Amino acid sequence: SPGIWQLDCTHLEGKVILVAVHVASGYIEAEVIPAETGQETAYFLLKLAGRWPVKTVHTDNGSNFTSTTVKAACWWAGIKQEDGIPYNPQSQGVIESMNKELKKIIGQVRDQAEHLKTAVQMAVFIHNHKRKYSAGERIVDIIATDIQ
Amino acid sequence: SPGIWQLDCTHLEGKVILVAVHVASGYIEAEVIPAETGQETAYFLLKLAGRWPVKTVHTDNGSNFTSTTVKAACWWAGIKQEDGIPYNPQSQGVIESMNKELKKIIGQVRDQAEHLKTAVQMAVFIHNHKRKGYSAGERIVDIIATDIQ
Numbered sequence: 168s169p170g171i172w173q174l175d176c177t178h179l180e181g182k183v184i185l186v187a188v189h190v191a192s193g194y195i196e197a198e199v200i201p202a203e204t205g206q207e208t209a210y211f212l213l214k215l216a217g218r219w220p221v222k223t224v225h226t227d228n229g230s231n232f233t234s235t236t237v238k239a240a241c242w243w244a245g246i247k248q249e250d251g252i253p254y255n256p257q258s259q260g261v262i263e264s265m266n267k268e269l270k271k272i273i274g275q276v277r278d279q280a281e282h283l284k285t286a287v288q289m290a291v292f293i294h295n296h297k298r299k300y301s302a303g304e305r306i307v308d309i310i311a312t313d314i315q
Numbered sequence: 316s317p318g319i320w321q322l323d324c325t326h327l328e329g330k331v332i333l334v335a336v337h338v339a340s341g342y343i344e345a346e347v348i349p350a351e352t353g354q355e356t357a358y359f360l361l362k363l364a365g366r367w368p369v370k371t372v373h374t375d376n377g378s379n380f381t382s383t384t385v386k387a388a389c390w391w392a393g394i395k396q397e398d399g400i401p402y403n404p405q406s407q408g409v410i411e412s413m414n415k416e417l418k419k420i421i422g423q424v425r426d427q428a429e430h431l432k433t434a435v436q437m438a439v440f441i442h443n444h445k446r447k448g449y450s451a452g453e454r455i456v457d458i459i460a461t462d463i464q
């Protein structure tokens with residue numbers, strides 16, 4: 168549970184926002200890319216697993232599940248790559264709701280930055296710091312409890 | 316102390332590696348950029364502060380200390396921007412030693428990736444997971460969780 172993350176890909180301004188959500192906390196990291204390829208998804212997972220103890224990733228679609236580049240980065244970083252099937256259906260709606268929330272945040276900061284990637288990082292910041300404890304607090308508590 | 320980070324810039328293959336080190340743990344994040352500008356450093360700090368509770372950053376040089384874009388991102392993200400002067404001089408050597416270790420890791424993985432940026436992220440990974448026995452990644456999470464609680 169502390170090591171489980173979900174990939175999610177959403178579209179804005181003709182670009183792709185790739186998101187990794189730490190399932191137990193709601194904590195996110197995200198990046199803007201021109202389009203979702205295995206190459207970009209593999210690089211993004213390497214960055215994520217170098218920063219947090221990523222044990223399991225539920226991939227966002229069958230192309231990234233299949234991708235031999237994604238499989239190679241999962242092997243390299245010690246990550247169990249799984250499918251993203253919402254066997255519990257509440258998962259479908261939870262990701263949908265996060266994409267809407269994120270885009271709503273993005274629209275609240277959009278005029279403060281020239282480039283989409285900056286507005287996405289401001290949104291990552293606002294999402295992780297929002298008290299609901301924040302997601303950022305929750306992930307650190309979860310993983311610290313796991314270490315002890 | 317849990318909120319204090321140090322910026323560090325080093326050079327490799329004609330490119331720049333920008334590093335933020337969490338001083339109490341030794342945990343790092345890093346990126347490759349074509350050259351260190353206020354613009355890149357501001358964007359890097361925004362990314363960092365969206366991911367960890369960054370309270371204070373000791374900037375790596377007076378150009379980033381002065382940069383109005385860097386000051387704007389520090390204001391936006393709630394970060395206290397400070398100079399990076401090694402008032403304890405053991406700081407000068409500690410950062411040098413980190414750049415040499417990092418570059419050594421980079422040379423141990425370099426042939427596994429076409430692009431420098433990938434080898435740098437593999438080095439970030441190996442550095443944060445190295446048990447020295449707790450790893451830096453363990454240390455930063457323990458420090459911050461202690462601080463929340």
Ligand SMILES: O=C(O)c1c(/C=C2\c3ccccc3C[C@H]2O)ccc2c1OCO2
Nearest residue numbers: 206209210213240243427428429430433
């Ligand atoms: O070769 C690259 O630099 C490269 C690669 C390649 C690999 C890679 C990347 C991550 C983890 C292990 C590995 C094993 C390795 O094959 C993949 C995506 C990228 C890359 O550049 C940006 O997106």
Ligand SMILES: O=C(O)c1c(/C=C2\c3ccccc3C[C@H]2O)ccc2c1OCO2
Nearest residue numbers: 280281282285354357358361387388391
């Ligand atoms: O305008 C951008 O998108 C942009 C900016 C601009 C700002 C910015 C960036 C971070 C935090 C607050 C702010 C306030 C804001 O002025 C700066 C660097 C960049 C950018 O693009 C990538 O590197």
